[PDB]
Amino acid sequence: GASGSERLLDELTLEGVARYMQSERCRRVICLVGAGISTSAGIPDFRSPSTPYPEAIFEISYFKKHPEPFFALAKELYPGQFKPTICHYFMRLLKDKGLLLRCYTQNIDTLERIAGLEQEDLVEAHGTFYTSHCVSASCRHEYPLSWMKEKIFSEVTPKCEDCQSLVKPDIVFFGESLPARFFSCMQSDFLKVDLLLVMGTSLQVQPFASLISKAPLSTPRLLINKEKAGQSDPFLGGMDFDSKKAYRDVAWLGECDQGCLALAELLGWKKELEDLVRREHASIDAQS
Numbered sequence: 001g002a003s004g005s006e007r008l009l010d011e012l013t014l015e016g017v018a019r020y021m022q023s024e025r026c027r028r029v030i031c032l033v034g035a036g037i038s039t040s041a042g043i044p045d046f047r048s049p050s051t052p053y054p055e056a057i058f059e060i061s062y063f064k065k066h067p068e069p070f071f072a073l074a075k076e077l078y079p080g081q082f083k084p085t086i087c088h089y090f091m092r093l094l095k096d097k098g099l100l101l102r103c104y105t106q107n108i109d110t111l112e113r114i115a116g117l118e119q120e121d122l123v124e125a126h127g128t129f130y131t132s133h134c135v136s137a138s139c140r141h142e143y144p145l146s147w148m149k150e151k152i153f154s155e156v157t158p159k160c161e162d163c164q165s166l167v168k169p170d171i172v173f174f175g176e177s178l179p180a181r182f183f184s185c186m187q188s189d190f191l192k193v194d195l196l197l198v199m200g201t202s203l204q205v206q207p208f209a210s211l212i213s214k215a216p217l218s219t220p221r222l223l224i225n226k227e228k229a230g231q232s233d234p235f236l237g238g239m240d241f242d243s244k245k246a247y248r249d250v251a252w253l254g255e256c257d258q259g260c261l262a263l264a265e266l267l268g269w270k271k272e273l274e275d276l277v278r279r280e281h282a283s284i285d286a287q288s
């Protein structure tokens, strides 16, 4: 139930969440993540202001007629390295510890995959650059990022080797529907969730934001983010961190890496997390 029933967290703190996680009551964790988990990897959030008309470049109709701007922007914004963050590897540890039901991400940077989350573990709600497809319905040839990268840097508009149609990265352009996978997984996963870990997202983009309202009433929800988010708008379920009726929502305010480190430390996972990150970062740095 809600605040009227007995609550699962013994206290509304990171410490309470950790105790819950290590109890038999918590078996399945869903992560909801956004751009805030990749900024420390040097991938800016293109929605953060500090980073025909401007919006055309992300519209599917404009792209199909004039793809060159998008692909020029893609070359300019292409990360110099793909090194997932502590937050990404914390989710890998959740997987290793048998706690990860699913990671729903709004990011297109592939860092979840690089950090060791597999397709089954992931719902890329806004799509991804990881794969691309020929846009012709009768073809739909798939291309890997290695192929798309070469086209982007060579400044050659990517065309299908089979039919010469445009090849589009599998991101959800505006005007496109979210992937069917998002809706199908959401319908199943939120019947099964014991904990919702919301990291590095302001929960301002829909329908991704509405996911928090899909959790059972009793399911604790931990937000690790620079700012509080997910509360109902006094003008326009929602997060309740602070009222007298608060019973399950916890906000840890700071950088995602530091929050995940703090949680891992409480869990006795800090050495495991350090060892994993340092090994994988070393491996990525040594790519030859």
Ligand SMILES: Cc1cc(C)nc(SCC(=O)Nc2cccc(COc3ccc(NC(=O)c4cnn(C)c4)cc3)c2)n1
Pocket: 043, 044, 046, 058, 070, 073, 074, 075, 077, 078, 079, 108, 109, 110, 126, 129, 130, 145, 171, 172, 173, 174, 175, 176, 205, 206, 207
């Ligand atoms: C080029 C490249 C390759 C790889 C692997 N990673 C990167 S990361 C840096 C970056 O930002 N690179 C970058 C390069 C070119 C273009 C963009 C813009 O990306 C997106 C991604 C998703 C959306 N769609 C929604 O938000 C949405 C739709 N419907 N709804 C409801 C919501 C829109 C734009 C990013 N960049």
Ligand SMILES: [Zn+2]
Pocket: 134, 135, 136, 139, 140, 141, 160, 161, 162, 163, 164, 165
């Ligand atoms: Zn084709």
